[PDB]
Design a protein around this ligand. Structure first.
Ligand SMILES: CN1CCc2nc(NC(=O)c3cccc([C@H]4CCCN4C(=O)Nc4cccc(C#N)c4)c3)sc2C1
Ligand SMILES: CN1CCc2nc(NC(=O)c3cccc([C@H]4CCCN4C(=O)Nc4cccc(C#N)c4)c3)sc2C1
Lengths: 394, 365
C-alpha cells in the first residue's frame, strides 16, 4: 500500500532508536568525504566529481552540527583504555557536562570497533536514576564524543581510599549496586564489568553505573555465548575467566560474583584474589574454594562473611541464581535505616560538599603523551565506516 | 551563532527541497554505498564487512518503501533519446497518468556524461512556471535514473509542422510562446543552448512549454556560460543571446518548411552557420534577419512589428485560444506521438559508480 509505505518511511527518519535516523544519515555523507578526500583516490573521475559537489556543503554542515570546539575543557577527571573523560562547559548554554572521547585509531588498530553501541543505547534510553544519562553523542575524523551527566561525588575507589568505610556504609552502597544491576538485567543486559571505578556518585551522594562498554544483550533464556573473557583481572568471575571457543556459556550470575568482590574490598581494604603478578590472580580465582581467606582481625560481621561467601562460589551454588529477591532476603541487608523500595530517596552516607558547578575535589588530579593518527591511504579503506550512525541529540 | 539558532539552520537544510544535504538526498548516499560496497573482493575489508552487516538489511527495507519503477505500469514508449527513453506511465496506486524519462547509468559512466541531468532536474522541479514541464518525482536504482513528469498529450511541434501547413497567424503565436518560455528560463539564471521544435511540447489546451533541458547550464558571474539550430558564437564565454538565434531558425523552418542552414552533409551545415552573412511577409523576414538584437532586454523582441496583432496580448498570451487544440478520447491518448519499438562489471576494488548520482532523489509536496 502507498499510504502505509510513507507512514513507515517517515517513522524511520525521526525515531531516535532508528539505524537510518536523520542524524545517522549525515554520518554517512560525512564519513564518505573523510575517507575519499585524498590525492590517490581523487584520481578516480567518480570520487573527484562527488567531492567537488559535496565538500563545499559538508564543511558548512561540520560547523553547524555539534563539535568538540563548542565545549570548554575545564579539567581531565578520568582516563581509560581508548580515551579520557573531561569536565566540560558548553560555550553557548554554559551547561556543565562530563565528556568521554574515544580514539578512532586505537579502536581500528585493536579491532574493538563495536563496544560503544550498547553503551550508547543504554545511557541514552535507560530512563533509570541508576544509569548516568547521555545527552549528546557526536564525532569527528579522530574521536567519538559522549556528552554525559556529570557526577560531582566522584568514583567509589576514591571513597574507600579517602574514608575508612564502616559496615553501615558498606550495607548501603552494596544494596544500591544490587538495585542498579537489576535495572540493567531488566533491559536484558549482563554488565560483565562491575567494579568501584565504574560506580559514580551524584550531587546527593547516590550510586549510578557509568561504563556500559562491556554490556551484552541476554538471550530469551537469560544466557550469553562468548569466546572471549571480558572484565577486570581482580573483579572477573571464574566461569567468564575461562570463557574460550566452545566453552563460553554464562548468565547474569557472573555480575553477582563482582558484587561479593566489591563488598570484600569495601570492608577488608584489598581485593580478595590480589596477587603481585597478574597470572597469580587468575589462579586464585579458579581456586576460590581454598584461596578466599578473611583477615584474623575483624571489624566485619558473620552475615557480611556469609554474603561474601554466598557470592564467591561456583555459579551453580552462587547467590542470586534464583532471582534478585534471593539476595534482598539475605540477613546482611536487614536494617532499621532504609527500605529496598525507597533506598535512593534516603540520605546517603557521604553527601558531596560542592562550592561551584565545576567542583572537582572528589576527582584526583591527572596529567593532561602524544597519540598516533591514520596514515594516508593509497586506496579506499573506509576507516570512518564502523562509526557511521553514532551521532545522537534527543 | 549560538546553540539554539544552529539547530534551526541545520533543520532547514534537512527539510529544504533545493538543499544538497536534503533528507531524501542523504538516503541516496547510504543506498549508493551499499550498492558499491556489497561485493566479495571488497567484503574482505573488516570495515566494509561491518558496515554492510549493519546497514544492508535496513537499506533493503527502505528500497521497498521508497519510490520504485515497479510502482508504475508502462502504457506506451512515447519518446527515445541518446541515453534513454520517455514512457507513458500510470502509477499503480493513485492511477495518475505521467510521462517517465529513463536514463542509463552505464551509458553515462562509460561516455563520462554524468552531470547533464542536474540542470534538467532543478529547472523542472523548481520552475513554478506554466512554460516548463513539471517534475513531480525523481528516483533511481542501480541501473537507471527516473523522472516522473507532466504528460504532454498535444505532442511535439515537429509533429505539428509535419501534419499542418503552418500559416503566419499560427507562427506568430508559437514564436511568442517560445520567447515568453525562454525569458522564464533566463530569469532562473539558465541558458538552454539548444532551442528546437523537438524540445517544445503542447499540453491538453494546445499551449507550448519547454521540456528537454539536458543542454542547459547555470549562469556564471552575471550572465555568461545540437546542430543545425546551433549559434555561431558557440562554435568558437557567451551569454543568453545564443538562445535567440535558435528562435529565428525555428521561425524560418515554420514558415519556409526547411531549416535555413540545411546541408546534405553535417559538415556543410557547420560552414553555412559561420557564413550566415552570405548563406512570406516583410515583417517575418525582418525578425529572422534580426536574430541572425535581444542583447539588452526581452522587451526589444516583444516590441517588434511582427508581434503586433488583434488576436492576443503579451501579458495574457497563454490564456487565449491555441491554434490547434488536441482532440483527446482518453487519459492515455497517444495519437499525437508517432509509434516506436518497445526494445556493470564486478569490481576488484572500490570504484563508486553510483557516486555521481547521489542526491538525485526528489519528492514534490
Ligand atoms: C576492551 N574493549 C571493550 C570495552 C572498552 N571500553 C573502553 N573504555 C574506554 O576507553 C574509556 C575511556 C575513558 C573513560 C573510561 C571509564 C574508565 C575510567 C572512567 N570511565 C568513565 O567512563 N567515566 C565516567 C563516565 C560517565 C560520567 C563520568 C563523570 N563524571 C565519568 C573508559 S575501551 C574498550 C575496548
Ligand atoms: C552529450 N550529453 C549531452 C546531454 C545529454 N542528453 C541526453 N538525453 C537523453 O538521454 C534523453 C533521453 C530521453 C529523452 C530525451 C529527449 C530527446 C527526445 C525527447 N526527450 C524528452 O526529454 N522528452 C520529454 C520530456 C518531458 C516530457 C515529455 C512528454 N510528454 C517528453 C533525451 S544524453 C546527453 C549526453
Amino acid at each position: 500500500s502507498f499510504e502505509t509505505r510513507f507512514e513507515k518511511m517517515d517513522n524511520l527518519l525521526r525515531d531516535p532508536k532508528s539505524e537510518v535516523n536523520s542524524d545517522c544519515l549525515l554520518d554517512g555523507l560525512d564519513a564518505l568525504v573523510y575517507d575519499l578526500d585524498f590525492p590517490a583516490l581523487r584520481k578516480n573521475k567518480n570520487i573527484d566529481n562527488f567531492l567537488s559537489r559535496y565538500k563545499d556543503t559538508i564543511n558548512k554542515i561540520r560547523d553547524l552540527r555539534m563539535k568538540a570546539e563548542d565545549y570548554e575543557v575545564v579539567k581531565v577527571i578520568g582516563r581509560g583504555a581508548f580515551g579520557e573523560v573531561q569536565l566540560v562547559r558548553h560555550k553557548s548554554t554554559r551547561k556543565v557536562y562530563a565528556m568521554k572521547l574515544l580514539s578512532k585509531f586505537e579502536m581500528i588498530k585493536r579491532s574493538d570497533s563495536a563496544f560503544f553501541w550498547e553503551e550508547r543505547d543504554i545511557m541514552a534510553f535507560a530512563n533509570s536514576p541508576w544509569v548516568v544519562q547521555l545527552f549528546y553523542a557526536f564525532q569527528d575524523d579522530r574521536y567519538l564524543y559522549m556528552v554525559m551527566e556529570y557526577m560531582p561525588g566522584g568514583d567509589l575507589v576514591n571513597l574507600m581510599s579517602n574514608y575508612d568505610v564502616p559496615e553501615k556504609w558498606a550495607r548501603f552502597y552494596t544494596a544500591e549496586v544490587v538495585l542498579a544491576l537489576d535495572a540493567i538485567h531488566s533491559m536484558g543486559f549482563i554488565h560483565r564489568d562491575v567494579k568501584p571505578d565504574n560506580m559514580l556518585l551524584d550531587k546527593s551522594g547516590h550510586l549510578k553505573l557509568a561504563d556500559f562498554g562491556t554490556c551484552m544483550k541476554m538471550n530469551k533464556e537469560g544466557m550469553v555465548r562468548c569466546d572471549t573473557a571480558v572484565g577486570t583481572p581482580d573483579y572477573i568471575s571464574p566461569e567468564v575467566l575461562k570463557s574460550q571457543g566452545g566453552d563460553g556459556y554464562y548468565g547474569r550470575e557472573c555480575d553477582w560474583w563482582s558484587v561479593g568482590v566489591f563488598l570484600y574490598e569495601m570492608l577488608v581494604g584489598d581485593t580478595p584474589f590480589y596477587a603481585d603478578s597478574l597470572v597469580g590472580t587468575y589462579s586464585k580465582i579458579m581456586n576460590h574454594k581454598n584461596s578466599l581467606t578473611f583477615p584474623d582481625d575483624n571489624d566485619i560481621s558473620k552475615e557480611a562473611k556469609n554474603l561474601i561467601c554466598a557470592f564467591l562460589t561456583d555459579r551453580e551454588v552462587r547467590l542470586g541464581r534464583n532471582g534478585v529477591e534471593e539476595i534482598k532476603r539475605h540477613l546482611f541487608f536487614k536494617n532499621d535505616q532504609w527500605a529496598w523500595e525507597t533506598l535512593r530517596d534516603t540520605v546517603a552516607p557521604v553527601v558531596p560538599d560542592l562550592s561551584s558547578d565545576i567542583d572537582t575535589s572528589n576527582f584526583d588530579d591527572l596529567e593532561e603523551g602524544e597519540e598516533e593518527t591514520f596514515p594516508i591511504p593509497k586506496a579506499f579503506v573506509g576507516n570512518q565506516l564502523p562509526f557511521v550512525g553514532f551521532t545522537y541529540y534527543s
